[PDB]
Symmetry: C2
Subunit: 445 residues, 2 copies
């Protein structure tokens, strides 16, 4: 009937074939077949990643791996509520116009010169993507880009549009790498291997600061924009007012608590998920101040991402319970011994960066982090390096518009060519592979 339905049926056939024709233990066979089924579903997007995540507990229970409540309890992890609080913050900013105010103030700090407005556009895009999202950030920044570029004759200077546009999209995708919020893959890794907000920040903030300038330089030295004119924005200067200040103060307090959780928590009793508690407190403070309402929060939040978090966690639990992780570790011990950690991370980064171009970053991270984590635990090899590397690589999607929402959004303008986008993404992917490998070897080891 449809390609998606045929893919689902073929995946079912593959599951049955592995179930009946695998000479391993029953539990290992079940886990491997389930892993292949979920992998095909997520990568091919035959069903929505959230629907597949909902399926994971169902076929875990029906095959006698977990009880229903135990399987469903993976959907209430503290990380999910942390990222819900992140959604609440972003909804408040959008409702109050804080993001627009910040962008306008930065572009005002640019007097009239487009030579610097584009670069500060990239910087503010990354800053917003730390907190709000990768998609909404690019969506709201695009009109600003077009307004700045309204006087540059977009028939003969299309290279400048490609610059200011792909830079914004990549800046959003990279700013999502700096914070636990901003990119769902970071949440998946943190949930898998117990990473706090500041623990992830110490990992992803230098990476983002070192990759964004590299991406901009690659763009500039691949395609040559002029960047010598001036821009006179027609939009009026939006000023500060009550509610924006309160939202900014709540945001700053929440960030301060997230950063200094460890001393604060040590001074309050030692709560287990203080970051999640702070996120919920942020929700409560915003509601009390009446700067955002639950209807806006609900509309802004992507609950499918949270359900996908739960599904990935359930898959990791299934792999750990069935012995599939340790079985794969025993199988791969010889290979990993022959070829060392440097090349292990090299190939992992290459695979993830070149896979997220075709597959969703969140689904790819949810699929791979459990595997390389539970397997790594069987090697010892604390599964923080691989999980964080996989999340960052998944966030690093640059070659195709379908790869990432902001890429598609910026491609919708019509001023960008498939060939140019693919080649720029190729060079950036190679550079990101090198940078991530070096970072993991040096700073993390």
């Amino acid at each position: 009937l449809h390609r998606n339905s045929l893919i689902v049926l073929a995946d079912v056939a593959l599951f049955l074939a592995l179930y009946h024709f695998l000479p391993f233990e029953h539990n290992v066979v079940l886990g491997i077949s389930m892993l292949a089924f979920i992998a095909v579903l997520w990568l091919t997007e035959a069903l929505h990643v959230t629907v597949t995540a909902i399926l994971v507990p169902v076929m875990a229970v029906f095959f006698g791996i977990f009880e229903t409540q135990a399987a469903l309890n993976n959907f209430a992890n503290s990380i999910i509520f942390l990222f819900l609080g992140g959604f609440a913050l972003a909804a408040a900013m959008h409702h109050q116009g804080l993001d627009k105010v910040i962008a306008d103030k930065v572009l005002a700090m640019a007097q009239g010169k487009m030579s610097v407005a584009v670069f500060m556009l990239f910087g503010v895009t990354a800053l917003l993507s730390m907190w709000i999202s990768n998609t909404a950030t690019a969506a709201m920044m695009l009109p600003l880009v077009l307004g700045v570029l309204s006087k540059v004759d977009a028939d003969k200077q299309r290279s400048t549009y490609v610059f200011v546009l792909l830079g914004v999209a990549y800046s959003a995708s990279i700013g999502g790498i700096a914070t636990l919020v901003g990119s769902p893959p970071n949440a998946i890794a943190a949930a898998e291997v117990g990473l706090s907000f500041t623990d992830w920040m110490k990992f992803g903030l230098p990476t983002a600061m070192m990759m964004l300038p590299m991406a901009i330089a690659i763009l500039y030295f691949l395609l040559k924009p002029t960047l010598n004119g001036m821009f006179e924005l027609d939009r009026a200067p939006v000023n500060w007012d009550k509610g924006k200040v309160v939202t900014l103060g709540i945001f700053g307090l929440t960030v301060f608590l997230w950063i200094f959780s460890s001393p604060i928590n040590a001074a309050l009793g030692g709560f287990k998920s203080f970051d999640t508690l702070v996120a919920l407190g942020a929700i409560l403070m915003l509601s009390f101040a009446r700067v955002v309402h639950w209807k806006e929060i609900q509309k802004t939040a992507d609950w499918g991402v949270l359900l996908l978090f739960g599904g990935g966690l359930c898959l990791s639990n299934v792999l750990k319970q069935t012995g599939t992780s340790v079985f794969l570790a025993n199988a791969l011990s010889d290979m990993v011994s022959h070829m060392g950690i440097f090349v292990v991370i090299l190939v992992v980064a290459t695979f993830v960066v070149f896979l997220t171009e075709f597959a969703s970053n969140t689904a790819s991270a949810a699929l791979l982090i459990p595997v390389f984590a539970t397997v790594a635990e069987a090697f010892g090899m604390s599964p923080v390096l691989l999980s964080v590397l996989i999340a960052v690589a998944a966030s690093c999607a640059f070659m195709l518009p379908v790869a990432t929402p902001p890429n598609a959004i910026v491609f919708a303008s019509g001023h960008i060519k498939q060939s140019e986008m693919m080649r720029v993404g190729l060079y950036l992917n190679i550079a990101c592979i090198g940078l991530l490998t070096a970072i993991a070897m040096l700073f993390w080891q």
Copy 2:
């Protein structure tokens, strides 16, 4: 600054006063103060009920009652996912126009006579409210009511409008009482005292069938409509097509599995939350058939209700853990001994029915079911009768437009008077009190 903020501050002061000036055990004092705080917040709607629910785990953790993960695990109960699957079903029906088709076919079964079209309008409204919702049902039925009543001269026959309108609203509110889905209070009671879909159906289906005709008769004998004309609907007759049939088949299969879970589950291994598994399977089947997509499901679903379920469950757990339930039971043992179960249920039903007029049905049920349940467990007195009675009474809101969304929606037309609505709701509330008391004493004991 604002009444809501002042209410929150006064509630904080009350919490501190109870915390410092209660001569009970520390845990009992903490539980009682927390109960009062949450009660005031929910009843006054100073903060959104969902926000208060999110607050419940936060102030449970910060006061050393539960660990963060244990407190948050109450938000992943199987009941929540059951009602999520109900949302998925409703979204599919709305997307495919199944509800509109059903209503049109029924009104076609009425040749042209409004004497019976109104009554079948009530019946179909209740049937849809069993599954879809109380609010969306009335919202989509109202245009049909106005179309039927477009030829009745709404300046001198306003009584007929009040009839056909309040009947639709009450029919929706009552149809929500027949199934576990349809009314969040039913979900709260089922989660509290482990009730299956058919277990609740055996409770709420006779109640709805016995209350809806009573409500219609009270309406007819209080206000006198003519109901002698004819209606010629301008809208074209929408016919069946591929996708509606598939959605109807999936809905029927899901209902069949929900009804016959106990034999089926006994024949498959004895899964713990087979109803929730069936709901998730319904989501999967709908997605596979491509009759609904996650974006429509997300837009349709009210995730605040699910979070409120989690918050109420956490409150019940807090009461059980702190000994507040047993302390209240010991305090009230003398009173409940002096005055028997008949009058206990009488006063409980009176309080709930006359409270849901001012307070949201879901929040009132979430507040009261934990109290009268955990307290009842301390008496023995299996807390099914009281929980189900409270849920039904909460669903029974008829006096004020602000009481229930469908009441407000039907009041938005402008053909209904506050005085008439209040008096009709008063008589219906009295009759519902009597009916619920009799049902609980006779069928349940």
